[PDB]
Amino acid sequence: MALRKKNSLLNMANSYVLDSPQPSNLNYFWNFGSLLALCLVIQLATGITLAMHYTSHASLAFDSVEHIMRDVNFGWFIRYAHANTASFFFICIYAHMGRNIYYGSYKTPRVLPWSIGVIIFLLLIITAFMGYVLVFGQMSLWGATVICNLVSAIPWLGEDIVHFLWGGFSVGNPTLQRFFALHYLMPFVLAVFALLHLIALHTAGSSNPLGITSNVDKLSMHPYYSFKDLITVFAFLLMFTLFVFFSPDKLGHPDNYIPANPMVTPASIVPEWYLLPFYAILRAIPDKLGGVIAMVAAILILLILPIVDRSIIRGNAFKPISKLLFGFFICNFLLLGVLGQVHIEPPFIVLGQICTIFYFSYFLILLPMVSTIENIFFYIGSL
């Protein structure tokens, strides 16, 4: 027996990266998983490096980031790499979630990897929010203020919990130092959950774009998907290069280059671009607590996809109506993103509410209806 199978440690590696049996027809949208792993590795390496130069004290934090930009050898690169990869991490994670929704990766028997995935998505959001605060520019401070004030909505204990998060009566030094510690930690927790969702997946194996069993036709993970993953690694690195080297601040908010000032409030306090759809969902509900619940529900509702999809067929490759509905859902999610960054003005107020209703009605009404109808059309249609 070959060593890679005999030795228990090697065999665990072998089972995931080498002999792992994969469907032979995975398309390029199955490459986001490895890109996300690459982002996670880049973020760990650049993040740990920034941590060697960053100072968490509010009196020094912003200046320590300037010191990294200006004084540390290649500090500019490590800083921009970390900041831009945070954006790419969300592009890739949305792509990965999009792939999973379109191809019905959330259906049995893959409910568990899907559900753990929803938690990974929440941890990524928390990680990225805390990391943004660490710069302690104007957007850092004001974003922390408004996002942490949402917890004030929790009845009875809300105010007390906010003071507890802040370690104080406003966002300041205690908040910054604790976010540093947690921002350092959270990516390791995220890595553990990412590993758990893979272990959960390994019982069923990857889905495939046809949505049929692949048990009939498997391919070793290496060399086939190893070399296929290289193509997207180099495509990713090209996109990374164009941002990091040529336009490092295209995805950034200029206000974050002004030191935090609790007195001056910036023109428009918006989250980072990847949180904007959730921000639009929050604004849609007039009630403070309602808004917070809706915003959380917009993420947690993904957990009910396994239930509300009533199709007898896995995924959308063969379902014309579901494909149209999915197209509208995705474009609406992008519109929500856009409405997250406009001013609270007519006519975007009403529009934001309509898009929010469309967002929720996809899970609660349209997907259950459309999936039921298509079941019937496949049966009657093939008689």
Partner: protein, 124 residues
């Protein structure tokens, strides 16, 4: 959803003259646009099989039907990875798109649903 549910609902529609007059033509167009026939699948090949019920139904297929199913799945997987479509004899013609599996899954489910009912019986 259960295949039982889908089949019962479809039979309600095929009974009602009005309903069939408007639904049958739609469903035929839907299936044409669905395009699974272009990969040489029969409709039934697409049903989710990773369920205890469906594993049982597949085990009950006659050997011939079972071997042919495996071929269609392998062939379609190869078309998928090649980004090609079936041509000629590989395209499933409407007359070849037979519900080979539906009777087996309906029997498996019938017993499973009777079992659930009878587990809840109350002597009167």
């Amino acid at each position: 959803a259960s295949i039982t549910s889908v089949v019962k609902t479809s039979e309600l529609i095929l009974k009602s003259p009005l309903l069939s007059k408007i639904v049958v033509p739609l469903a035929k167009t839907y299936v044409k646009f669905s395009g699974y026939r272009q990969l040489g699948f029969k409709m039934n090949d697409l049903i989710i099989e990773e369920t205890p019920n469906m594993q049982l139904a597949l085990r009950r297929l006659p050997p011939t039907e079972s071997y042919d199913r495996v071929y269609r799945l392998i062939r379609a997987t190869q078309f998928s990875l090649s980004h090609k479509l079936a041509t000629g004899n590989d395209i499933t013609k409407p007359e070849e798109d037979d519900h080979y599996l539906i009777p087996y899954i309906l029997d498996v489910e019938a017993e499973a649903f009777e079992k659930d009912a009878l587990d809840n019986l109350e002597v009167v």
